[PDB]
Structure formats: C-alpha cells, structure tokens
Swiss-Prot record:
Record-listed substrate binding positions: L32, F107, S120, N135
Top enzyme category: hydrolase
Family assignment from sequence similarity: Belongs to the glycosyl hydrolase 24 family.
Stated role: Endolysin with lysozyme activity that degrades host peptidoglycans and participates with the holin and spanin proteins in the sequential events which lead to the programmed host cell lysis releasing the mature viral particles. Once the holin has permeabilized the host cell membrane, the endolysin can reach the periplasm and break down the peptidoglycan layer.
Entry protein name: Endolysin
One cellular component (GO) term of this entry: host cell cytoplasm
Gene from which the chain derives: E
Keywords annotated in UniProt: Antimicrobial, Bacteriolytic enzyme, Cytolysis, Glycosidase, Host cell lysis by virus, Host cytoplasm, Hydrolase, Viral release from host cell
C-alpha cells in the first residue's frame, strides 16, 4: 500500500462537489475548494483549478482531473511537512509506512495543524509508537474523526497498513 491509496480510501472519490467533515465545499478526493458557505464560490475555485491545470464546471469534475488535484494536494503536503521545523525532523526519522501516516494528517488538517501535536510528535521521534498512538487518541482530531484517527493512529502504532486491509 501507499499514501495515495491510503487517502483515496480515507477521502473517497466524488466527482461532484460535497461537504467536508466540517461541511466545507470540497470535491474530488478531499480537495477543499472554499470554506465559504457559497455554493457558487466552490464552483468558482473549482472552475479555477479545472480549466487551468473554454469549458465550465457545475459541481461535477472528471476523474484524473480529480487525481491531478489529489496528486498536487499530496505533494503540497510533503512540502508543508518539510517547510515546517516541528514536522521535518519527525517525518525524516519515520519509516515508509509511518511517513504516510503523517502525510495523511497534514493532508487532513494542514501543516500547522499537525504541527500542534507537539507531544505526540516527540513520542514519534523517539519511536515510542504505543505511547504516541495513545497520546494522539486525545485531541479534537480523534474526537471529531475517530474512524479516520483510528486508522492513522493504528498505522503509527504498528508501522503496517492493517487498518487499511
């Protein structure tokens, strides 16, 4: 398995605009378009990214057009991670599988969002899986999206893809 499939599952692939876990106008594979409650707004940032990467876009989108955005979003993640000091070191000390569990997190709540987990990051640098996997268990992250949190924690705690079999 790999980070792309991991998120594909954890995000799903919807070609028409949908609402985030928080109800933000998102599309494709977890690609947020706008936090604004405006429907036309989404389609604006949408059409923006689509006929860019004389047609339009009314909620709908085409696969691989969604995978183009997904591919960047993910890279932009690894970029966010390396540009942040709290995250670059952790990310660098982790194995193939665990690097993906962090990429996932930054993907879901952004660079600085996953940079806030200061303690769980320490535990992770010291390769204290179980201890770090229990620490992450306490946070709005886990509280708000436990199913997602359970899979990523598991991945951190075991270093395997068991939660995604």
């Amino acid at each position: 398995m790999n980070i792309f499939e991991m998120l594909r599952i954890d995000e799903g692939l919807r070609l028409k605009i949908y609402k985030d876990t928080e109800g933000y106008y998102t599309i494709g594979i977890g690609h947020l378009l706008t936090k604004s409650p405006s429907i036309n707004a989404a389609k604006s940032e949408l059409d923006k990214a689509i006929n860019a990467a004389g047609a339009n876009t009314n909620g709908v989108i085409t696969k691989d057009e969604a995978e183009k955005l997904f591919n960047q979003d993910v890279d932009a993640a690894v970029r966010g991670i390396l540009r942040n000091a709290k995250l670059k070191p952790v990310y660098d000390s982790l194995d193939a599988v665990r690097r993906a569990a962090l990429i996932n997190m930054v993907f879901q709540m952004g660079e600085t969002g996953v940079a806030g987990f200061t303690n769980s990051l320490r535990m992770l640098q010291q390769k204290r899986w179980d201890e770090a996997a229990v620490n992450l268990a306490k946070s709005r992250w886990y509280n708000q999206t436990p199913n997602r949190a359970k899979r990523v924690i598991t991945t951190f705690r075991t270093g395997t893809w068991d939660a995604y079999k």
